[PDB]
Design a protein around this ligand. Structure first.
Ligand SMILES: Cc1ccc(SCC(=O)N2CCCCC2)cc1
Length: 117
């Protein structure tokens, strides 16, 4: 009624959460799709807001211009759907990580919102 709430991990390691069911169409491979991305720290500190550009991030799914959690996340995400994709410190920035923005060892919380495909 009010909504669902569950967490599940994949074999790759990445994770994702349901925020808003999308009744449109799952992202296609080899095609460009516009979606909004939001980077949040372990505490909730925002370090990236696609909304800044005032437009959806249009990128080709399965091209190589994103991270594992991205390809896998969008691969399932549907138009108008919103899911919280959780990427580890290994499948994200990398062993180096950001100077002060993001720590070396920590879970990165990224929000994905499909606007169009
Ligand atoms: C603040 C900040 C500025 C530049 C970067 S690098 C962009 C990046 O690595 N992205 C991963 C795939 C989704 C789009 C963003 C990371 C953080």
């Amino acid at each position: 009624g009010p909504g669902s709430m569950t967490v599940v991990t994949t074999e790759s390691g990445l994770k994702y959460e349901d925020l808003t069911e999308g009744s449109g169409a799952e992202a296609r491979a080899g095609q460009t799709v516009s979606v909004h991305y939001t980077g949040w720290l372990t505490d909730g500190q925002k370090f990236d807001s696609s909304k800044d550009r005032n437009d959806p991030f249009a990128f080709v799914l399965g091209g190589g211009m994103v991270i594992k959690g991205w390809d896998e996340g969008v691969q399932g995400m549907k138009v108008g759907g919103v899911r919280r994709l959780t990427i580890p410190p290994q499948l994200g920035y990398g062993a180096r990580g950001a100077g002060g923005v993001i720590p070396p060892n920590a879970t990165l919380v990224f929000e994905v919102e499909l606007l169009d495909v």
